[PDB]
Amino acid sequence: MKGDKKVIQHLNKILGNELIAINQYFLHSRMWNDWGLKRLGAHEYHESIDEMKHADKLIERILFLEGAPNLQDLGKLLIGANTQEMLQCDLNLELKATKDLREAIVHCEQVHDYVSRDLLKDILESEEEHIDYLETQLGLIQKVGLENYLQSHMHE
Amino acid sequence: MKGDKKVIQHLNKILGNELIAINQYFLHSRMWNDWGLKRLGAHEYHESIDEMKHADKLIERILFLEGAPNLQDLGKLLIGANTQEMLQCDLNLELKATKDLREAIVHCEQVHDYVSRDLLKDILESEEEHIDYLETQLGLIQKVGLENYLQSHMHE
Amino acid sequence: MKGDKKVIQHLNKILGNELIAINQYFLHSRMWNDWGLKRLGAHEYHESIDEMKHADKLIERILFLEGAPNLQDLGKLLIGANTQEMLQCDLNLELKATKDLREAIVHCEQVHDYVSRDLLKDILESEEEHIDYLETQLGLIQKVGLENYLQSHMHE
Amino acid sequence: MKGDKKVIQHLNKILGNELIAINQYFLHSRMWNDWGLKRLGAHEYHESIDEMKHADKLIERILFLEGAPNLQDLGKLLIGANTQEMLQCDLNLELKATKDLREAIVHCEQVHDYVSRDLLKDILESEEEHIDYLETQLGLIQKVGLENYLQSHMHE
Amino acid sequence: MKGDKKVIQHLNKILGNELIAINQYFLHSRMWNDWGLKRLGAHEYHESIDEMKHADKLIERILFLEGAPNLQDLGKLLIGANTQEMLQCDLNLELKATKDLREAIVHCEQVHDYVSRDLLKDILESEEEHIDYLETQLGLIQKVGLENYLQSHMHE
Amino acid sequence: MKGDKKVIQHLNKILGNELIAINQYFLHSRMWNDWGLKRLGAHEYHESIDEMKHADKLIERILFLEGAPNLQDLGKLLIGANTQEMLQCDLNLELKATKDLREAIVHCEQVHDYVSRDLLKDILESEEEHIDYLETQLGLIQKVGLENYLQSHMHE
Amino acid sequence: MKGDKKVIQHLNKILGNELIAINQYFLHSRMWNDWGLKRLGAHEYHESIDEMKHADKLIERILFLEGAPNLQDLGKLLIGANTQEMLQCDLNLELKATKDLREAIVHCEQVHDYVSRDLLKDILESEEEHIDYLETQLGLIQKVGLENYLQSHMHE
């Protein structure tokens, strides 16, 4: 079904953001596992998987709309060097992702692509849940102290 | 455990090949599903998942060896425009992948990294199984005709 | 129990025929599997196993009759280059096998070895069932066309 | 996938050794059953089946590598006349088999056919287990005496 | 259904042989049990039962053919004094039984009593299996020695 | 089966290393249990058991190769006085063990003892997994602090 | 709990005896398995495991009493060259072990370490049961003959 050209551009932009997140979260996950912080590693693995599922839905929508999904252009991964940096890197990425999602939804509404809007709203809900998680973890580091926070994430 | 610098370079090169294949196969899978060739779509999805699992093991090994996994540099995806081209694109990618795997195993043997060698041999066995599948499909197109071959891949 | 010398010769001849067929059908099976014609590969494997079972019973009977089973002399395998040739090669072998089975039964009847006759009759029934299968496949190639026939034998 | 010509020659040589062993062990099995030494008959049957399984894997690998499996040439079966001779005949065959397996592995390593090497290594491990069994039986004949050894192999 | 007079005579001759065997095997069974060779006793009991079942089928066939089954004339039991002689007595009886069975089958074929032939062929197969057992036991006495052979038949 | 003298010497050296580790890990396990650090005690017990299983396989291989397993020579146990020292003692032992394993594999490859090589490679994988565990624990002591690290290992 | 220094010395002496027995019995077990005497191999394996359990309890008691368990000073293994010698080696080791256990119990009683006495009494009961097993085996070799004794220990 012939989609709106700018909608497809927006969908490819969100897809690009999800592709960055998949790799960033997968690497952070395996870094945490390497360090023995297995609870963080497992949670971050599930965040990566959730981004993979969003990327799948975007690819499927783009193809239905007769566009070309762009899996070639990978933007900058924000890789941290320690737990605090990794959480903040994920939060920085998520804040950029939600800004782009909001702009995409505006355009979908303008051209009456209500189904693409609905898909993007669902993704935005998931990304805001991730922001909640990240903000909460950074707050816990301050409340319980870093050593305790890391201790609480050694075991699954 | 401090690994050999060139082994880590080889492991990152294999990882880069797996990252290309993940995206290439995932996109091909969703293209075939879009076209209603659901048996091809499902098989290619499983091929993509298999490459994800190999990428995971490479990342884990690189981190154990105190190297930095490179998920940032994504090489050229070989995306075809019809079934015949897509299968050949996958085969071309796989033949490059096995070349690099053999060169990596040579070096692991030379520096006595026998555990990395074993991991790479297991990946190589999977990639050769993929080559067998691809060669077989291209042969079947010749034996049964393209229209019958596609028909046989409509339903799961 | 001391058997008739010419009976034992006949049983060793039939055994020789079964040993050809085991290997011919096993190789044809694995050729079909290599080509992705898995329904033909599976059926042909079961034909090979059935011949293995006949060979076992012949070996056991020869030994009971105090003869020496000959598993050393392997006659000519008739290996085809494509599906049509392979089926016809199997049929040519089977027609020779049934000729020899009938001559063996004649001699068993003449010297009153009724138990060996019964064993050979059961083998003959199986070989005639295989001829039926082979004639039917060759006829189906004519009726549905080669490409359709092969397509129908891709999936098990 | 086009294999190395000498690798394929080596694989066909190992296949030829497996085909001898299939027939030698099957006949030895049925001889032991004929004599009422059913525990030896059963064990030797399982040795024959194991060689059949190796032969299958070799045939499959040769076909993948675009070679022609040779099931036509059958080398010399070493058939004993009593239990001690039959066990030594099996051992003699196995020692030749392991020599050829090592030479095939050397060549596979030299041309970087690491998957064929791994297959041959697995077969070699099975053959060394068979050697262990055979040496152990011959040793038990010495330790418990021939009559006791045979008595212990009457019943399954 | 009025049968052929000579067929009925042959069936009564075979029945007479089965009646000798029932009693000879039953007595041997109970002699072996009395001596504490319970494995021989149980096997010989099952041989006696098998002859009882053959006698039943012969009686049934004779009555159908409107003949008079002869259960009155019992021929000479071959009773041994020790295990070796008892086995040889059974073998001697079985070799007479198979000679008579072959002669009966010849006549059934001549007069086209194909159902009686088939019954007799099934009995003949059973009697040859018994010959196999007996020859095997006598061979095992030679291979493992009498004392070990008897030891192996103390316990069921 | 007559093995290579230097292979057997290497296998006995690896065996000697495993015998040190059994006792060192078992004592460290029971020291941690005595101190109430039951999670460390249990994990270290399982490390000891894993070394026992490796020692068993080496003994079995040496005997198969007609060598004399050396369980008499016990090298120096590295026993620590506190958790930090005990982990470093285990790591020091493991790094010696992997050096010896690589040297043994080199020699096995040179003389074509591919089955002994494969055994040693499997042991090497296990020992590298143990190095990963140890390096990770030492890293966690730095990241969460010694008191938290010990607290986290009080309860199973 | 501060234990008596001489008690701790006695406990380390008993521990040293158990450590010899662990290794002696494990090696004898694997020697019997290599020779095909699998019933002896299994039984001796269980004897080795039982000694491992006693060693564990001694280590635990030493640590509770604030002593240093000595797993370093391995005494002389008594390794036989055949079944008869191996059994007598085990018996010689056990007779030394019970002598030392009795001397340790005397001292525990004298200083009122009744819990250590009870542990040693339980170990002594186990060691006397092993003596019973060993004396019985040596007696059976005399009563049934060596070849029969070994035959009875081929199969588990």
Ligand code: HEM
């Ligand atoms: C285009 C990028 C990717 C896409 C679209 C994608 C898609 C998916 C999907 C749909 C699943 C199944 C999720 C579920 O329903 O449970 C999955 C699983 C998985 N992915 Fe990805 N993925 C991508 C990249 C990656 C990468 C780069 C890695 C690792 C470096 C990875 C690792 C995994 C793993 C380990 C699994 C679980 C596989 C299993 O054990 O079943 N993925 N992926």
Ligand code: HEM
């Ligand atoms: C090219 C030579 C042969 C090949 C490749 C071959 C292969 C096989 C295979 C793959 C199986 C199934 C094994 C399993 O996974 O359970 C099998 C079974 C068997 N084979 Fe063979 N075989 C060969 C020759 C023979 C010969 C020469 C005999 C006897 C004279 C024989 C007797 C049997 C029997 C009795 C079975 C068990 C069948 C059943 O009851 O299901 N085979 N063979």
Ligand code: HEM
């Ligand atoms: C010395 C003479 C015989 C003895 C001692 C004998 C003994 C036995 C015994 C102990 C049984 C098992 C009964 C049970 O516990 O259920 C049996 C079964 C049987 N007997 Fe006899 N028998 C003799 C003669 C015969 C004869 C002469 C015939 C037929 C003409 C015969 C036909 C049968 C049949 C048909 C069975 C059942 C077998 C089955 O289907 O399991 N018996 N006999």
Ligand code: HEM
């Ligand atoms: C200080 C010396 C040793 C101690 C304290 C020790 C302790 C133990 C313990 C407590 C068990 C578990 C027993 C149970 O409850 O089932 C065990 C199992 C075992 N031990 Fe030892 N052991 C020692 C030395 C050895 C040696 C030297 C070997 C072989 C060379 C060995 C081989 C084994 C094996 C194979 C198992 C069974 C493991 C399994 O499959 O679960 N042990 N040991």
Ligand SMILES: [K+]
């Ligand atoms: K805490």
Ligand SMILES: [K+]
């Ligand atoms: K005996």
Ligand code: NA
């Ligand atoms: Na479509």
Ligand code: NA
């Ligand atoms: Na193919």
Ligand code: NA
């Ligand atoms: Na042995």
Ligand code: NA
């Ligand atoms: Na009696």
Ligand code: NA
């Ligand atoms: Na026989």
Ligand code: NA
């Ligand atoms: Na304490």
Ligand code: NA
């Ligand atoms: Na680490």
